[PDB]
């Protein structure tokens, strides 16, 4: 059921962001988020995955880093910019 | 019962740290601590000796300096570094 190994990924930045988030690589995750098409949803996904992995982390330092992921802050700030710009396209983006 | 005056001290940094701590010379004590083999235990010893001498100090300035010795802070920060590094060798160090 796996796709063709020879095909280009339809959402390459989405895939790279997921791959970097799933292994607590927050700098690359920030870069792939800043290079992605849908950044508010991506930041919310990153927030969810980080708070899900914070429970599974064995080391205290990694768990602390996951608990201080600040991806929800990225979503909030980007939506603040969007809502200041239009305040009507912002609702469409929300829905 | 005193040892040989001609022999090298087995723990020279330990002896210098004790000598500097016992006379409220905190800069040399910090140097000898930073140059010692077992620094968490040495910092805890310095904390103990400083809080013991703070009661015996006659002048208020010296007593204040002893009461602000911040050797326990050195032990805490070094153990924070050690616990962040391994978190398993840290327990062995503790025990």
Curated annotation (Swiss-Prot), chains A, B:
Family: Belongs to the transient receptor (TC 1.A.4) family. LTrpC subfamily. TRPM5 sub-subfamily.
Subcellular localization(s) per the UniProt record: Cell membrane
Subunit and partners: Homotetramer.
This protein's domain notes: Contains two Ca(2+)-binding sites that are allosterically coupled. The binding site in the intracellular domain modulates the voltage dependence and the accessibility of Ca(2+) in the transmembrane domain.
Identification of the protein by name: Transient receptor potential cation channel subfamily M member 5
Function summary: Monovalent cation-selective ion channel activated by intracellular Ca(2+) in a voltage- and temperature-dependent manner. Mediates the transport of Na(+), K(+) and Cs(+) ions equally well. Activated directly by increase in intracellular Ca(2+), but is impermeable to it. The activation mechanism of TRPM5 involves a multistep process.
Superkingdom per UniProt: Eukaryota
